[model samples]
Target: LSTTNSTLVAAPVNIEANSSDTSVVTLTLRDNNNNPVTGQTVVFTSTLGTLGNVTEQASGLYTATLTAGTVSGVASLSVSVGGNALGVTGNITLAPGALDAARSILAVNKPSINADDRIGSTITFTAQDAQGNAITGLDIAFMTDLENSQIMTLVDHNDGTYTANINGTQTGIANIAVQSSGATIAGLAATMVTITPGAWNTTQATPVMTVALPITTCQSSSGVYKRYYIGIVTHELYDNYGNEISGILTYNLGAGRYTTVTSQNSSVSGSNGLTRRSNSPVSHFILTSDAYTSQAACYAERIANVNVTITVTAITDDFKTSAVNKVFILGTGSN
Candidate 1:
């Protein structure tokens, strides 16, 4: 003769994504008489994320899986049973997951540099918050691959920009990293720069060329039946520090090889930055003889056994001139 109203009760819960993408929450149901309501199917939905299938267990308890959103914040979940929306709802507070190093951005100017050289660009960072807004006043620290962190000096411009300079003489590949002081962010973001030996003097070390020694190539005809052998030799230029540089290459072909020696110089269009190999080298040796066997023998002797001398004169905009001689062995082969 009396009817009891079955009440649904829910409470707020907080879970961390921690090391995983999904966080689990348990939901419990009861009748107005405070007894467990078994044999019931409950539907679950969330406002911010996808809901996993509801798992029924003993004593009206159901487990749910929720995937946290990329942006950290509070998410709401509602439950319903037998076509009647339950008065029970859950508030979930999702904290940021393990810091994603890849998500962090570390930018620097002059990613390429020599030891003790000042970088051309300022280092800047754009760290985001839970709401995906760039945050300011975050403590940022810098590190490098050098044994001493002092090799690089970082000056925070206080406006999300930083400037860096190389102070030490360590030469090699340097990995520069920036880390945030906030606990919510883990690890660091890094970039690369190159350090080379300091300045060059009269006793500067010899620069290397990428071309193979004793370079052998078959005679190619630049004209008609009146075939002529045209040899265009290439050489990459580098400084005593082993860093690529722009220069003029002059070659001296051995005797009985060619009639004229031609040299080409490369120019930096806008500014003198890093001079790549594609923009290096110069040479021309013309053979207009009628004997094919004579042309082949002449090309082979250039680097076959004797040393082929290459004179590289570094021409810079600063009007500074330095010359060095590179010797390479020569060898000949047939096509």
Candidate 2:
């Protein structure tokens, strides 16, 4: 067949790198009358790939197997009859689509994040081939070195780049790694991000102490008109990670309509108490079973003259686990 009026085309225009895929290259040769030009020496050539033997499927149609070369690049296929050269009429694209850990880039968006924030640092992974060509359509997974319920869902941009978030469970240097079964990404170390710990741990605070003052009938001791069973309870706060979480702790008396004795009482049922500092971690209150006392400190008149236990809790302003403590005090009618 003559090389004149010959056209070429490939079934698949793109193939993956180092894959077992093969493309069929078809060449149609015709004469001046558009008749099938048969019985001619035909050859197909590719710049970046290998070609199998040529075969004439029909009168004017000739086909060849096109396989990708070792490298990924543009494959320009040329056709010729006998020794005469034909112009370029077909091309195939080869893509590097496999994961290459050595050529990948790992980036952590933030160095540190809040503990259990539910939203943490973002990690980006850029995949590439050993030759530095972008490797698209690769599967990547992210995980931390610490044990948590954190599942970093990858958001693949389909451009050889992926993003995921981590460090939303607890505190530690979460060393992130891209793993696939038992494969570890070599040629580079894992990307580590810190999850800071500052959440309040609900157990107990430091220096939980106790003090007592007697409650006698109009005993002009710490108050007037009556004696109060004053129990001084104090403590400090901490987090689950053994870190200090200061501020936002309080105290309260147990089993009484005991209003805090900031000063004296207003009237009966008139809750006259000290306004505890909102930002402070101290729990100070003067309480009595009698809310009808004239003075705030003038509280409680009973026959059970014995020691009583005062209960107070160190609660969080941000709200979390709380701790309880007790203080002992001597008083009358303190049942």
Candidate 3:
């Protein structure tokens, strides 16, 4: 009979480097009349591991050695009963040895991202053996400390590296952990990826406006010097993201109160966009040149002892966004 009437089988069908490194495969042959026939030239061929020559161990039982290859993975074995004609094929597994936790490495794609980011990031684990050699047929897992499957997926490239995908649905620090067969990877069992809140929403920005008070110039003074002195106002500003920022402030003393105050009329007339970006009082306020000589107001309001209510507008240098607040400039004896 030919290989058509024969059967092939393998005992202890899998080989692992850390443990047993070989398996014995057997083949049984029969003639056309169903009688044991094994005295023919039989052969064994394998895909991934070394295969020893076959020898008849019994009347119909032919055995061969399936040695584990240095490379780990699934291996297939094919047999021929008569000439080059083959019978049933057999399969075996070549598993990797123990993982070298100290030699393995974990890599993160994104170090930082917005909390609401959908683009997400990836964490990769590269497996290695005690000899620092790459291990391909090993299984790796990411711990529960990371996100769930809805936001991530584990991928095995089979090239010694396993990658895990994730999103930034939750803010703050996200630590990742990878393990293989209960063995932890290198780096103290934890790796961090930073997640932050969204950007500054300009429309929701806040501000605090205040005048230094007590304009030292005399309102009753009637001289060319009463129209060009400069006065400063103080302010504090914040945005929706709680970030402090600065820009030019426009102080409107209402109607045409300081219209003829010379410097007040043109010194910072929108064209002098000095983007004050510091929390420093003198650095982040509206400076309209007015008739204030030696802390005395030469403007008409201060002359009448009428406390001036100026509408202070605060804005951001980058966003160019503005908002308004009314503050008072105490006149003489009106403090």
Candidate 4:
């Protein structure tokens, strides 16, 4: 059987508008089959890049009204077709308006990146007002738990909306919620969403990584045969609050080296591109810096299995050696 592919693009790439002037942003849509879709029920959503939000007209047509207190920043825009889901998403800028009427509405919009998965996954929520105006620097909160003990709080996008890094924690029914404020106000509030994890992706153990650095040796004489180093690692992905993260996991080994043992080549090395997971656990990885630096200096011994345990800290903290037992020197003599 053959697979199907789709692509959507928006043109006139840039739009300049004033606080006093109502701007009309146009979007042209295309389908997976490369057909221009008209009257297909397209919806455009925006978020303010600053504090307050601007009200957008219906029919996906948005108008930016300059208020008394408007800040300058970039705004995001998303266009979606009824049958095609989220179509094209992009951004525009809000410059300083003329005169004392400096107030301008900067729509900080974003694309939809939420879906259900059993094992682990990334859930992204974008924030905007009912008028499709973008929200800036607003507080967006999140929560998800199939199991009460595995409950997690998602991080804020800062622009509005929340995101939860889920690891398929307990499998029953998972409920996801997000709101602009803790309590409901008239028009400044958002809604909460629920999801069932079991129906999403349910094949792995618990989403939580209860075990840390449990090693398994592979030697020929002791059980297998190897004359060099052997290591095995198990990793889990989580958020800042220790919530499991999901995506793709890629490894970059310096100097063109690799793990002796292989299984689907889950191990990768290097910088940039691929190797990311949904909810990620720092099970094991070897960051590849300059091949001539520390990478080429040492010769990694051949091994079977090794275990890597990592703590859940912000990636912004440190990219390398941010955990316990990150490196092992191994035995002195023969195996």
Candidate 5:
């Protein structure tokens, strides 16, 4: 195969504010010949942002946190790899996409629940970019802003795909967002998912809390070691046909089992219903630990398996519904 090259030495970087919040520009590595150098070590040293020097990510793909919500302006990005320096003369701009002009709505998966506690159910949704491509490596969490409330985190299934496993506290509206991970992608938007938290008996379970939690760690409120529940999360691809695509669901909790929810691709109903599933969920996660260090208040019920096998179909944008009230946001992590 002939090696392809990009003439654009420095990306327009005119990134949209409404871009995908998951994926980051690892680095824009360029050789003097203006070619994308693979396997070359390039360090992206930033002058205006927190994420600096995302090295060895993808050739010409510098990594930085994709902060949730809105951010604007231009930042000077200095690129240097090996003995050759691309120089600070190169510029990258960040702009917002048009799609993020509005907030999206998330919906619930409507299938009868299985009475068999051993056999659980699965719910899936969609997340996409303004240009409408698959967004990967996003951080998604469920509602945990309320007392006795809980939070759950899911990983992108890949290519703008993500999945979460449902178990306890499965039902109810949760806050969601694609967080800023030091890498930035403007105009990235997300949808929501309505879940049924298992057999409802009016018995309110005390909030299962995972304190001082790190990624992929699973624990419950009763101080019992609970395995991360298997939930199905979704992300929509840019310009995806209205049809839903099938994906294999899987995740790693700080501690838990590797469970997979398997099902064929099914038609996603409603406007943003499928896409809402793609929105990353989070409810404020900060607590006081020390003067210099604040405790991370966020906790999660990990996911075991997240698999979708349904055939995808397409729909018209006119048929898409408004996400207005569909999402219950906690603003700055407050539910």
Candidate 6:
């Protein structure tokens, strides 16, 4: 085996980040005799960005992929052999590459909304750089394809998130799209917004009212034991428009199984509460209880199941009344 001096050279000494151009920086090793030098280790280093693993292709040919930095400038590569620097080097002029347009995406917060539902849906758009990092402060334009139908209202949160509110008056499928500014992107950045036709009503809301009945603890004295009925009730209220409105709601709760039962709000009475008379009762009802609270408590013996109805009635000034014959199933406990 013979040993001499070697030289290194790189091809296509210019590059653009994320472009179609080949990133392989080729290095050729030749001896002092200008012949191919074989069986030697070469280390590659970059001045601007990180260099990929150096791979040997042939006897004298080796390559390393160059990843350009964020900003464009002179990027050079140095080679070393036997722990010593090789005087030969490769210089590349780098330029800014186009953003990865295909990776940009749009997402919808709510896929569906009702016609009478005033609070519509929100749409978010995320813009990314060529590196796929989240790009902020991008002005994202939003709109619906509907022309003669209900229009969409958009609010830009300044960040990547964009809000789209649909008009509940007109009901139909709204095809929405977000156009990102500053850069031309690839792929369709759009989503579908479904506005189903329906009026906002309590029946649609279907506020849940839960009745919990635990085992009653009885005091034992003689052969016969003494026991009393104990129960706890909680409820949620909604208005005629199906929207959760705030105010007082009066309910006469009763259980068919319990012979004697009375309802009371341990938290507070009709401080905002009002009662009614006659058969029809009140019309418009207000949602007094923000959440399920202790509405009423009662006493009943050991019972498996019972039918319970919370009679709720509310009235408007014009004598229009809304009464809820809300029925519930009472049980000892879930098996």
Best of the candidates, lDDT:
2
TM-score of each: 0.37, 0.47, 0.60, 0.23, 0.24, 0.31
lDDT against the true structure, per candidate, is 0.47, 0.61, 0.57, 0.35, 0.34, 0.50
Better of 2 and 3 by TM-score: 3
Per-residue lDDT tens digits of candidate 5, residues 3-33?
Answer: 1332212344555544343324444445557
Kindly list the per-residue Cα lDDT of model 4 for residues 166-203, writing each as its tens digit: 54433333544444457322332232233322222222
lDDT of 3 by residue, 1-335 (tens): 65566777676665664433878887877777768885778888878777887888676878888777666666777876566757577777776766777767876788666544566677888887764656875667775353421236777787788888666544456777777767756654456776554434455434445444334444334332343233444554443444343445555543212223333222223222223333445422223444455433444433222334445555544434455454545342121
Error of 6 at 216 (Å): 62
RMSD after Cα superposition, model 3:
8.0
For candidate 1, write residues 92-185 as lDDT tens digits. 7655533345454676666665543544234555554434423345566666676432534655554434455543345556676666673333
- TM-score of candidate 1 relative to the true fold: 0.37
lDDT of 2 by residue, 24-103 (tens): 89888888677878777788888877789999877778888877765676788887878787764888888885667776
Ranking the candidates on lDDT from highest down gives: 2, 3, 6, 1, 4, 5
lDDT-wise, the better of 1 and 4 is: 1
Ordered by TM-score, highest first, the candidates read: 3, 2, 1, 6, 5, 4
Give the Å shift of residue 77 in candidate 4.
Answer: 23
Model 6: CA > 4 A from native: 1-48, 51-67, 70-101, 147-165, 182-186, 198-335
Over the stretch 51-126, how does candidate 6's per-residue lDDT look in tens digits? Answer: 7788777767777876666545566778786677777756776544443456756777787775556777766666
Candidate that beats the other on TM-score, 3 or 4, i.e. the better one: 3
